Design a protein around this ligand. Structure first.
Ligand SMILES: [Ca+2]
Ligand SMILES: [Ca+2]
Ligand SMILES: [Ca+2]
Ligand SMILES: [Ca+2]
Lengths: 28, 148
């Protein structure tokens, strides 16, 4: 499939967030 | 509080439903721990207490909206897109055999909530499979994650 970037990448993007929320709690 | 445009409340709303398991209007220890579990870690019960208590300004045992924004406004930490690059590999390479196996990928769907069929599971693999070796190598993994 052309531009298979969307399918693969989409999920990567959410993982960055996953831990964005929790980082707030730990504070480094 | 650098968010003054309404549009931002709109965005935040959707986000709230992301961790709100029972949509009770409050964040509880139960739903907190489930999401972290998805991070592939096995946090102990005491973790639920220690972490929640630190963010829980009103000492009501849960986190509400006001307590939410305070963190969001200061949570501007800069994550070098690289941090998830190498790390994202270790999770996918479950047995650390130097390759990403189909069985290992299948579990990924569950985390993303795509609920993909057998057909789509095979489809994605074909896209990165530059050679009929039946497995996805590190090079193929990068080619796919080469979004921006
Ligand atoms: Ca909730
Ligand atoms: Ca509270
Ligand atoms: Ca493997
Ligand atoms: Ca291959």
């Amino acid at each position: 499939l052309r531009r298979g970037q969307i399918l693969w990448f989409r999920g990567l993007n959410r993982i960055q967030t996953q831990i964005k929320v929790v980082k707030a709690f730990h504070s480094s | 509080a650098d968010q003054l445009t309404e549009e931002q409340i709109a965005e935040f709303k959707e986000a709230f439903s992301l961790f709100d398991k029972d949509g009770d209007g409050t964040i509880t220890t139960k739903e907190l721990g489930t999401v972290m579990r998805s991070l592939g870690q096995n946090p102990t019960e005491a973790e639920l207490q220690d972490m929640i208590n630190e963010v829980d300004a009103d000492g009501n045992g849960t986190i509400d909206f006001p307590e939410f924004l305070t963190m969001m406004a200061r949570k501007m930490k800069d994550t070098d897109s690289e941090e998830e690059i190498r790390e994202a590999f270790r999770v996918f390479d479950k047995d650390g055999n130097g390759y990403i196996s189909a069985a290992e990928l299948r579990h990924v769907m569950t985390n993303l909530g795509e609920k993909l069929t057998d057909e789509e599971v095979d489809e994605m693999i074909r896209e990165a499979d530059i050679d009929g070796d039946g497995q996805v190598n590190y090079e193929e993994f990068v080619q796919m994650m080469t979004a921006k």
